Design a protein. Structure first.
Length: 118
């Protein structure tokens, strides 16, 4: 059956330029919590995130961008297209060109839980 497909789990993968949007998003984003590669892609990370921890998210991703070749992991909080206010648990690596050794993107992965274990 050519119509067979599967896009699960409760995780996704992404790229964000030092720009405030995920300049690339993967379709497991369409599965994890449910927003496209167009409802999350070229869509403002900071404004489309929770009312609080968007600072922490921004403080963390500058802690990724702080260097050009390293990886950080923290808990975050996110809300998909429909109504799924949810956690995110994510890891972001600064990505260098290096044609020039400039910082050129932040490549990354994302995971969630329904809430913290506390």
């Amino acid at each position: 059956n050519s119509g067979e497909i599967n896009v699960k789990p409760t995780e996704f993968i992404t790229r964000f330029a030092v720009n405030g949007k995920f300049v690339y998003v993967d379709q497991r984003a369409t599965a994890i919590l449910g927003y496209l590669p167009q409802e999350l892609l070229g869509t403002s990370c900071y404004e489309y995130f929770h009312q609080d921890d968007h600072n922490n998210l921004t403080d963390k991703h500058k802690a990724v961008l702080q260097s050009k070749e390293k990886i950080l992991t923290d808990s975050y909080k996110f809300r998909a297209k429909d109504g799924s206010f949810v956690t995110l648990k994510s890891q972001w690596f600064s990505f260098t060109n290096p044609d020039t050794k400039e910082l050129e993107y932040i490549v990354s992965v994302n995971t969630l839980v329904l809430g913290h274990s506390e």
